[PDB]
Write an enzyme that holds these catalytic residues in place. Structure first.
Site, PDB file in Angstrom:
ATOM      1  N   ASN A  62       2.363  -3.642   4.658  1.00 48.22           N
ATOM      2  CA  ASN A  62       3.611  -2.894   5.297  1.00 48.22           C
ATOM      3  C   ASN A  62       4.871  -3.300   4.143  1.00 48.22           C
ATOM      4  O   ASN A  62       4.542  -3.546   3.153  1.00 48.22           O
ATOM      5  CB  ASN A  62       4.148  -3.422   6.470  1.00 48.22           C
ATOM      6  CG  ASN A  62       4.243  -5.077   6.730  1.00 48.22           C
ATOM      7  OD1 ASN A  62       4.741  -5.450   5.637  1.00 48.22           O
ATOM      8  ND2 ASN A  62       3.826  -5.693   7.608  1.00 48.22           N
ATOM      9  N   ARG A  63       6.042  -2.830   4.710  1.00 49.03           N
ATOM     10  CA  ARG A  63       7.151  -2.758   3.986  1.00 49.03           C
ATOM     11  C   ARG A  63       7.555  -4.329   3.422  1.00 49.03           C
ATOM     12  O   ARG A  63       7.764  -4.744   2.348  1.00 49.03           O
ATOM     13  CB  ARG A  63       8.400  -2.264   4.511  1.00 49.03           C
ATOM     14  CG  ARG A  63       8.262  -0.646   4.630  1.00 49.03           C
ATOM     15  CD  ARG A  63       9.531   0.007   5.212  1.00 49.03           C
ATOM     16  NE  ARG A  63       9.620  -0.100   6.622  1.00 49.03           N
ATOM     17  CZ  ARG A  63      10.430   0.183   7.635  1.00 49.03           C
ATOM     18  NH1 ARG A  63      11.250   1.476   6.894  1.00 49.03           N
ATOM     19  NH2 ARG A  63      10.571  -0.070   8.744  1.00 49.03           N
ATOM     20  N   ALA A  64       7.476  -5.307   4.534  1.00 48.59           N
ATOM     21  CA  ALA A  64       7.742  -6.682   4.259  1.00 48.59           C
ATOM     22  C   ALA A  64       6.617  -7.254   3.334  1.00 48.59           C
ATOM     23  O   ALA A  64       6.930  -8.021   2.355  1.00 48.59           O
ATOM     24  CB  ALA A  64       7.821  -7.381   5.554  1.00 48.59           C
ATOM     25  N   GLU A  65       5.389  -6.801   3.459  1.00 46.21           N
ATOM     26  CA  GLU A  65       4.279  -7.300   2.623  1.00 46.21           C
ATOM     27  C   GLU A  65       4.392  -7.077   1.160  1.00 46.21           C
ATOM     28  O   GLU A  65       4.404  -7.830   0.278  1.00 46.21           O
ATOM     29  CB  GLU A  65       3.009  -7.158   3.277  1.00 46.21           C
ATOM     30  CG  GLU A  65       2.769  -7.645   4.684  1.00 46.21           C
ATOM     31  CD  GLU A  65       1.159  -7.212   5.232  1.00 46.21           C
ATOM     32  OE1 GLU A  65       1.342  -5.966   5.524  1.00 46.21           O
ATOM     33  OE2 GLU A  65       0.611  -7.945   5.816  1.00 46.21           O
ATOM     34  N   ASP A  91      -3.997  -3.428  12.424  1.00 45.48           N
ATOM     35  CA  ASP A  91      -5.428  -3.539  12.585  1.00 45.48           C
ATOM     36  C   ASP A  91      -5.924  -1.954  12.723  1.00 45.48           C
ATOM     37  O   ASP A  91      -7.341  -1.865  12.405  1.00 45.48           O
ATOM     38  CB  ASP A  91      -5.944  -4.401  13.602  1.00 45.48           C
ATOM     39  CG  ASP A  91      -5.436  -5.739  13.322  1.00 45.48           C
ATOM     40  OD1 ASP A  91      -4.963  -6.169  12.318  1.00 45.48           O
ATOM     41  OD2 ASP A  91      -5.899  -7.085  14.072  1.00 45.48           O
TER      42      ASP A  91
HETATM   43  C1  LIG Z   1       3.758  -0.371  14.463  1.00 48.33           C
HETATM   44  O1  LIG Z   1       4.318   0.960  14.397  1.00 48.33           O
HETATM   45  C2  LIG Z   1       5.608   1.294  14.803  1.00 48.33           C
HETATM   46  C3  LIG Z   1       6.286   0.078  15.097  1.00 48.33           C
HETATM   47  C4  LIG Z   1       7.741   0.443  15.392  1.00 48.33           C
HETATM   48  C5  LIG Z   1       8.249   1.625  15.601  1.00 48.33           C
HETATM   49  C6  LIG Z   1       7.345   2.669  15.269  1.00 48.33           C
HETATM   50  O2  LIG Z   1       7.977   3.856  15.337  1.00 48.33           O
HETATM   51  C7  LIG Z   1       8.249   4.422  16.540  1.00 48.33           C
HETATM   52  C8  LIG Z   1       5.874   2.469  14.779  1.00 48.33           C
HETATM   53  C9  LIG Z   1       5.133   3.464  14.744  1.00 48.33           C
HETATM   54  C10 LIG Z   1       4.341   4.226  15.508  1.00 48.33           C
HETATM   55  N1  LIG Z   1       3.563   5.260  15.295  1.00 48.33           N
HETATM   56  N2  LIG Z   1       3.670   5.787  13.881  1.00 48.33           N
HETATM   57  C11 LIG Z   1       4.364   4.899  12.695  1.00 48.33           C
HETATM   58  N3  LIG Z   1       4.122   5.395  11.629  1.00 48.33           N
HETATM   59  C12 LIG Z   1       3.043   4.748  10.814  1.00 48.33           C
HETATM   60  C13 LIG Z   1       3.007   3.307  10.820  1.00 48.33           C
HETATM   61  N4  LIG Z   1       3.724   2.242  10.666  1.00 48.33           N
HETATM   62  C14 LIG Z   1       3.215   1.005  10.898  1.00 48.33           C
HETATM   63  C15 LIG Z   1       3.627  -0.102  10.758  1.00 48.33           C
HETATM   64  C16 LIG Z   1       2.732  -1.239  11.188  1.00 48.33           C
HETATM   65  O3  LIG Z   1       3.375  -2.513  11.053  1.00 48.33           O
HETATM   66  C17 LIG Z   1       4.662  -2.927  10.758  1.00 48.33           C
HETATM   67  C18 LIG Z   1       4.841  -4.319  10.407  1.00 48.33           C
HETATM   68  O4  LIG Z   1       3.750  -4.884  10.211  1.00 48.33           O
HETATM   69  O5  LIG Z   1       5.829  -5.051  10.389  1.00 48.33           O
HETATM   70  C19 LIG Z   1       1.404  -1.146  11.620  1.00 48.33           C
HETATM   71  C20 LIG Z   1       0.995   0.188  11.908  1.00 48.33           C
HETATM   72  C21 LIG Z   1       2.040   1.179  11.314  1.00 48.33           C
HETATM   73  S1  LIG Z   1       1.297   2.841  11.413  1.00 48.33           S
HETATM   74  N5  LIG Z   1       4.944   3.883  13.383  1.00 48.33           N
END
Ligand SMILES: COc1cccc(OC)c1-c1cnnc(NCc2nc3cc(OCC(=O)O)ccc3s2)n1
Ligand SMILES: COc1cccc(OC)c1-c1cnnc(NCc2nc3cc(OCC(=O)O)ccc3s2)n1
Ligand SMILES: [K+]
Ligand SMILES: [K+]
Lengths: 299, 299
Positions: A193-196, A256
């Site tokens: 992710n962005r943080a990682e 995951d």
């Molecule tokens: C975990 O995903 C979210 C978390 C917060 C807000 C979000 O958007 C409204 C999302 C979200 C929901 N649906 N699609 C998306 N865009 C693609 C993704 N972004 C992330 C980010 C993830 O982890 C974020 C982290 O590790 O901090 C995990 C899976 C996805 S998939 N983001």
């Protein structure tokens, strides 16, 4: 994607398995021995964590999954085995009688955590090499390998596993853990992710800065592609033939879910960009429920 | 006392059984989910608690002991059974599949408690009456009954048990718990400390005030004698034929040791005042080590 096409999608999940356990109790008094709360536990919940949850997602999409990992000869060990059997995941566990099965225990009262308790150890060198031998046997039986790292010791020999998998024409996906990615050398796709991404590559200022910051990192690690998850901003696939962005459509265990979806798709013979696209829809769903997206919901 | 005279001293311990468990860990970080410590547990210790420890002491003095109590159909249940078998105590447990075995879990790091966690429930009415039936069968096989109360539900039918035991010419010793002692009615001896005595009888100002404050309490409860433990000041036996004081000679689990000693002695046929005297020496020792005084040390 026909549910019979991905029915023969075989994913070998490898990495750190664990049990996420929760204690919910009442705190009415202080202990007579110490100035600490007393928690009368009223109930306990638990679910498969780590690589186990990653393997759980591959099955619910219609595909098949295997789990190569290490547990101990104890109660949570038995529990994971039971929880695996009732989730459609083919277990390939190594047992270490000297190892405690990794478990993250949360103690809660009034919908608030009081403490977290971890049980974990480094697998013995003997056990790790046993598993590596199993990987040799398990590799031909699968279409794609998924490296689920949680820094517990299971992926000590990941560099070797990767180079063996790539030599057999099998994709190697890596769910990262930490700032050292030199061990992930030779991987097909890596999914931070962005943080990682920062702790390895630092902070950046423009998609053109991030763009090249990823390009060299891929170039010095024999890593063919990087899938950067950006939450609200969606995903970005940096493949050397180009880039692909996918916005959200709507939170835990979503990481995951995305890498499991990409893995199970590639195994089904669907192209990468399509696999990443589908991983976005799967992502947009589990954030609306841990959870496991079914075949009926994705399409 | 000949080790063969107290070899045939049979004590029936009845009450709340439990497991005292301890987790020792390292706390280096804060959880990512909550502002709470993370405890990586490195080791676990455990010992028999409650009525179980009381029964443990009767055996080490050379005598025999039985334990009538309730456990659950779980892991700590199995553990108590194992711990009982390896301590010389004859187990007479009722199993309640709906009951969690009573366990007091301490979590520690840096030689300091962070939290205590309790598992406990009220035995079902069905189970309690089953146990009461066992008491009927077990009573003739013993010389003296010991009521070890911990307010967990095991001594719900203590008043009935007491009146049955006294009707058979068997002594009934009670290790108190709480401010309601009306249930202990008819008991031979009751053994509170200074703190425990207050909440029932209030605070006092002279051994002549305490003297009469005990006299009426014994008179309204069909209780023949009270053994008041006073720590540094020793013990005082208020028996209606007189009083007997015994100073210290030199800390945890000492209350269990004193009432166990008195019980095992009476069963061996030794007089009360002598039994109380010996309970003082046993007390002066376990505070120098939980612990269990052996036959070799007492005499
Ligand atoms: C975990 O995903 C979210 C978390 C917060 C807000 C979000 O958007 C409204 C999302 C979200 C929901 N649906 N699609 C998306 N865009 C693609 C993704 N972004 C992330 C980010 C993830 O982890 C974020 C982290 O590790 O901090 C995990 C899976 C996805 S998939 N983001
Ligand atoms: C637990 O006993 C002690 C505790 C602190 C200081 C002590 O004296 C130096 C003693 C102690 C040691 N040896 N003999 C005696 N006198 C007779 C007793 N007083 C108590 C008090 C007890 O519990 C005190 C409590 O529940 O607070 C338990 C057993 C005995 S036995 N007291
Ligand atoms: K969720
Ligand atoms: K002690």
């Amino acid at each position: 994607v026909p549910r019979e096409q991905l029915a023969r999608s075989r994913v070998l999940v490898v990495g750190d398995v664990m049990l996420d356990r929760y204690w919910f109790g009442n705190v009415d008094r202080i202990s007579p021995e110490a100035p600490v709360p007393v928690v009368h536990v009223q109930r306990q919940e638990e679910r498969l964590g780590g690589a186990a949850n990653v393997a759980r997602n591959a099955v619910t999409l219609g595909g098949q999954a295997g789990l190569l990992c290490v547990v101990g000869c104890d109660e949570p060990g038995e529990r994971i085995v039971e929880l695996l059997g009732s989730s459609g995941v083919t277990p390939h566990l190594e047992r270490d009688p000297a190892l405690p099965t990794t478990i993250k225990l949360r103690v809660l009262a009034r919908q608030q955590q009081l403490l977290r308790v971890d049980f974990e150890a480094m697998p013995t060198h003997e056990v790790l090499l046993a598993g590596l031998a199993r990987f040799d046997v398990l590799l031909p039986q699968h279409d794609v390998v998924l490296m689920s790292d949680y820094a517990k010791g299971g992926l000590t020999h990941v560099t070797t596993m990767i180079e063996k998998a790539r030599a057999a024409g099998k994709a190697v996906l890596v769910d990262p853990k930490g700032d050292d990615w030199a061990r992930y050398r030779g991987a097909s796709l890596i999914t931070p992710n962005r943080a990682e991404l920062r702790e390895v590559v630092g902070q950046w200022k423009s998609e053109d800065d991030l763009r090249a910051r990823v390009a060299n990192l891929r170039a010095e690690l024999d890593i063919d592609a990087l899938l950067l998850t950006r939450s609200e901003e969606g995903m970005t696939l940096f493949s050397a033939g180009g880039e692909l962005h996918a916005p959200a459509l709507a939170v835990s265990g979503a990481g995951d879910t995305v890498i499991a979806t990409v893995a199970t798709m590639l195994g089904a013979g669907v192209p990468l960009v399509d696999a990443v696209v589908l991983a976005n829809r799967a992502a947009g769903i589990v954030v609306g429920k841990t959870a496991t997206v079914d075949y009926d919901e994705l399409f």
